[PDB]
Design a protein around this ligand. Structure first.
Ligand SMILES: N[C@@H](CCC(=O)O)C(=O)O
Ligand SMILES: N[C@@H](CCC(=O)O)C(=O)O
Ligand SMILES: N[C@@H](CCC(=O)O)C(=O)O
Ligand SMILES: N[C@@H](CCC(=O)O)C(=O)O
Lengths: 307, 307, 309, 306
C-alpha cells in the first residue's frame, strides 16, 4: 500500500515531529518517520556536515524498508547541498529537498503545502532515476539547474534557461523533462570512506578588482579557486596576474560567471578552466569533488561538461 | 536634425570614425560627431577612467550645440559605468550607452542595429529627463535596474522585476515607465575636480566562506566592503567575525545578495547596512560615491533607499 | 489611521460575508479603519460589462467623500485584469483603488488570500500610493491594471508583466516603489461613464491555421459594433480572415488587430485592414474599444486612444 | 560531412538564394535545397502541412539523408512543427528554422539561425530528441515552444519547460530530453489521408456570446478548442453553448488563454482538459486524435501523454 518515507531534518525556517504533526494529511500519502540530523540556518552549513549528510542518506537508501527520502533545509544554501548529494548518492530512489521562504508562524506560510508536495513526489514511482530534486511553490527542479534567484520572494527558485523537471497541480504530478547530464548511480564520485574535502574559495569579478585577494587565498592553502567573473569569465590585468601566481603554486583555477545564467565558453588565450553552465556556487561543489579523484586539468574540464 | 556626439571607450562594437561609416544610416537620423575617449575591453575599465568619462560628458552636455550623447562600451561592465554616470551627470539631455554581444565581424552582428536604435533614442525629444539608459536588442533599460543576466546570449540585458523603460519596434519608440528614483539633475553627487575614489571591494557569500578575506581587505586599506551574500544578505559565523573586525577599524559594510534580484531588508540582529534592490556591482558604485561626501551610516543607508 | 472601504464582488478569496472576511484577518484592523460592503458574489468568469459599469459608478461615489481615503476590491482572478483596466480608465480620483484576489481557496493549506489582503490594505492606505492608477496586489507584487495579466492557469506567481515589470513590491511589511507608468489614466482620462446604462457589443475572434470566415459573419449577424482579433504574430491575417474583416468593415463594424502571443507591440501596417492594439493584449483591447465606441466612431481618434491609454 | 536537405516553405528568412547568401553552411555539411512552397505562415493550411509531413517521412527513409532543415515563417511554425512532431516516423533530426527580421534588414538574424540549424541537424547527438525549432542560439522542443512576443528576436520561449539546449561558440550544449511521446513512438500516421477533421478555437472573456458555439455547430466542426479564462473556467453562456455541442456529438476541449500552465480536470464542468498544451497546440493534437477515435476517455489520455 503506502510507501515508506524518511523525513530527515537539517534546519531552516520550515520545520521535525511538530512539522509532521502540523500537516497530518501526509499520513494519507505515506508511512513517514522523522529523523533530526541537525538544526541550523543554511548559511552555516559546512562541507564536513554535508559530507556526513550524503553518507547518512546512502545508508538509508540501501535499506529495503525505505522507498524515498525528504530533506528539510534552509533556502539560502540548499542548491549547494542538493547538488552535492546529486553527485554522491548511489541509488535511483527519490531524494527530495524541501524548504520554505516564510517562517512557519507567518500568515499564509508556504511550508505546509511545500512539505505535502515533497512527500507526494518522493513516494511516486514515476520519480525514480531523475537525480536529486528540489520541491517548492508547486514546482520540481533539478539540483543541477535550480538556484535561488530572488532574495525574498516565494517564487524565487527558477532555472531560467533549463526550466523545471515537472509541476504539481491538483494533487497530480506532471513530469516534463529529464536532464541530459550524469548523476547519482552513474557518477564516478564516491565520498564513502572520506572525512575531509579539498579547500576551494570563490573570488568576485568587477572594475578595479584586487590582485591581493588571490595572494591571501594561495597563502592560506586553497587547492582551487572559482572565479565569478564579469560576462563570460572575462579577466582584468590584475586578475590575470593573480591567476598566474596560483597556477605556479599548483592551484586549479576555474572561471565561472557573476551574471546568473549561461555558458562560459573555452578560450585558449585566457588562464584556467571554464565552468560550462554551472554558476559559482555549483562550480565550487564539483571542483572540490573533482580534486578528490584527480589533479589533471584535462580530466577536470571534462567533468564540467558532463556533470 | 539633432546634434549627437558619439563617444567611444571600447568594446567589440567598434575607431569611432570607421564605426560611423560602417553604418551610414545614422547620418539620416542626426548630425553626429565622433570622439575617441579610450579603447579597451570593459573588464579593464577602472574607477579613475570612469571618473574622467563622467566629467567629459558633463562638459559636452553643457554646450548648447549638443542635444545628446551615445557612449559605446563593452558589455561586461557597462552596468557599472552607466550607473556611475546615472548619479553624476547634471543634465536633462539623453545619455545612452550602447554595446554588442557579437563582434562586428560576426555573421548576424547585433552592433549595427543597436547603434542605430541608440541614436534614435538620444535624438528623440521624449527621451529627456529619464536618467541614463542602456539600449540593446530593441530594448531601453534604466542604468539603475538593468544588468547582464546571461554570459553569452543576445538577450542578456534584463530587469526581471522592474521591466524596461520602453521598446523600439518599426523605427518607433514606445515608452512604458519612468523610474521612481532620484538621478542626474536631482542627485547630490558632485565629482568636479576629483582625481580618485575611495577603495571598495566585494566579497562572495557561500558554504565555508573564510574569515581571512576580510582581514586581507582591511589590511590593504579598503574604506568599504560590499558583501554578495546568501539569500537576503545572510551571514555565517565566520562572515560575522570578519565584519565586526571591519566595523571596528571603521570600514563601511554593505550587505547585498548573490541571488541576482530582489530586496535585502533591514535586520537589527545583523551587522552592516542593506542594499535595497541594488545588486553587488551597482552597490559598490553607490558606496564609493557616498564615501566622497560622508561616513555617517545613517545617511549612507538613506541613499540606498532613494537612488 | 486611514479610512479604507473593502468592496466585495466575489472570488474564492472571500462567497462568504465581507465582514466574516475582515474578522478572519483581524490584522488589517491595525493598518486602517476598515468598512466592508457586499457589492456582489460571483465567480469572475461570470462578471459582465453592465456589472463592471455599476462597480465603477459606485467607486466614483465612494471616493468623492472626504471620509474615504481608498478602496480595496476583492475579485476573482480569472477576469480581474478586465475589471481592473475598466476602472483604471473611468475612476475620476487620485485616491488608491486596489484590486486583490487569491489563487488558492480560503480552506486550502497555505492559502495565499490572507497575506494578499493585508498587503492590499497597506498599499491602499499609504500616502505614496496616490496618483499611480488602478493597481492589482498579489504575491508581494504591485502591478498596473494596464500591464498586468494572468500568465499561468494555476500557479501562485501567475500575475506578471514580462516587458513592463511591476510598479513596486512589498517585503518585510515595507513598500518599495520602482516605476510610474507613462500612460494616461484616472483623473486625466476622457472616458466618463457616469450616466451610462449599457455598453457597445464587442467580441474577440482567434487567429490560427485554417481559421474560418463564418465566425465573422456570425458576429456581424448578431449586431456587434466592434471586433478584437487575437492574431498570429504581430496581428497577421490569413486570406480567410481578411475576407471576414472586409465584410465587417463594409457593414460598419470597427476592427482592431491584436495578438495571441501574450506580449509585445502590434505595429501599424497600412497594407492590412483594421486598427492596431499597440501593446494591449486581447482582453485589455476589448475594454478600451468598448469605451471608445461610447464616445466616437472615428478610426483616427480610436487609434490614438490605443497609443496613449 | 553529413547530408542535409533544406526544405523551404516560405517565411521572410529561392532556397538556393539563401544558400548562396550564407556559404558557411557548406563547411558544416553537404547541403541540398528543395522548394516545397512559398507562402507566409499565416496562410499555411492543414492540407499543406499534411503533404509536408508525408514528404519529410519520404526523405528521411533514404540512406543518403542524415537530417532535414525546414525554413518557415514565425507566426505559425509552432503549429506546423508540432504536427510533424507527432507524425514523423524517424529518429533522424528534423529542425525548423525561421527569422524575425527580413533578410534585407540591418543585423538580420536569419543567416546565423540557419547556420545553427544545420549544425544541430548534422550532429549525431541530436538523434531521437523529437522535432526541434532553432532560433536565437536556442534549441526548443515543438511540444513546448511558442511565439511569446509579437515582434522581438527573443520571442520563442518555453517559460516553465525551458530549452532542450543552447548553441554557443559553435558548440552544442544539450540540457534536457522531453518526457512525452513523439515521432517513432507516436500512434498517429497520416499516410494516405488528404483531409483532416474540422476543429475551431473560441475565446473566453467577460460577456462571451453563446451564438458563436451555434455557428460552429452549424458548419460541421467535429471539435472545439476553448481558450478559456484562467484554468479553463466557463461562464453560464459558455456552458449553454458547450452542452449543445456535446449533444450534437462535438468534442469540447478546454484550454487556457493565459499562455502557460496546467488546466486540471474538473468533472463539474463540460468537456475535456488540455494538460499543458496551449490553444494552438491543442487544436493540432485534437485533429489527429479524431482520425483515430471519438471516445472522450481515450482522447483525454492522448492529451496527458503527447
Ligand atoms: N537564512 C535562513 C533563512 C530561513 C530559511 O530559508 O528557511 C536559512 O537559509 O536557513
Ligand atoms: N569582455 C569584452 C566583451 C566584448 C564586448 O562586450 O564588447 C568587453 O566587455 O569589452
Ligand atoms: N474561476 C474562479 C477561480 C477562483 C478565484 O480566482 O477566486 C474565479 O475567477 O472567481
Ligand atoms: N507573417 C510572416 C512573418 C515573417 C516571418 O516570420 O518569416 C510569417 O509568419 O511568415
Amino acid at each position: 500500500k503506502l510507501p515508506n518515507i524518511v523525513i530527515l531534518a537539517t534546519g531552516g525556517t520550515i520545520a521535525v515531529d511538530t512539522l509532521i504533526n502540523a500537516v497530518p494529511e501526509v499520513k494519507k500519502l505515506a508511512n513517514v518517520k522523522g529523523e533530526q540530523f541537525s538544526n541550523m540556518a543554511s548559511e552555516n552549513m559546512t562541507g564536513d556536515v554535508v559530507l556526513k549528510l550524503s553518507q547518512r542518506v546512502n545508508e538509508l537508501l540501501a535499506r529495503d524498508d525505505v522507498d524515498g527520502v525528504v530533506i528539510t533545509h534552509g533556502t539560502d544554501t540548499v542548491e549547494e547541498s542538493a547538488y552535492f548529494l546529486h553527485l554522491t548518492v548511489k541509488s535511483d530512489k527519490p531524494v527530495v529537498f524541501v524548504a520554505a521562504m516564510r517562517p512557519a508562524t507567518a500568515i499564509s506560510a508556504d511550508g505546509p503545502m511545500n512539505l505535502l508536495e515533497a512527500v507526494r513526489v518522493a513516494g511516486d514511482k514515476q520519480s525514480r532515476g531523475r537525480g536529486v530534486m528540489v520541491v517548492i511553490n508547486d514546482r520540481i527542479g533539478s539540483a543541477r539547474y535550480i538556484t535561488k534567484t530572488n532574495a525574498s520572494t516565494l517564487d524565487t527558485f527558477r532555472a531560467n534557461e533549463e526550466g523545471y523537471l515537472g509541476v504539481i497541480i491538483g494533487n497530480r504530478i506532471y513530469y516534463q523533462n529529464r536532464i541530459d547530464k550524469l548523476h547519482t548511480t552513474r557518477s564516478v564520485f564516491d565520498v564513502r570512506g572520506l572525512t575531509s574535502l579539498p579547500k576551494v574559495d570563490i573570488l568576485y569579478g568587477y572594475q578595479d578588482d584586487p590582485e591581493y585577494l588571490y595572494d591571501a587565498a594561495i597563502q592560506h592553502g586553497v587547492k582551487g579557486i572559482v572565479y565569478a567573473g564579469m560576462g563570460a569569465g572575462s579577466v582584468s590585468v590584475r586578475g590575470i596576474a593573480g591567476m598566474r601566481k596560483a597556477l605556479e603554486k599548483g592551484v586549479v583555477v576555474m572561471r565561472s560567471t557573476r551574471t546568473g545564467n549561461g555558458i562560459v565558453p573555452p578560450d585558449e588565450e585566457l588562464p584556467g578552466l571554464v565552468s560550462d553552465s554551472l554558476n559559482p556556487a555549483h562550480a565550487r561543489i564539483l571542483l572540490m569533488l573533482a580534486l578528490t579523484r584527480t589533479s589533471d586539468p584535462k580530466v577536470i574540464q571534462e567533468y564540467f561538461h558532463t556533470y
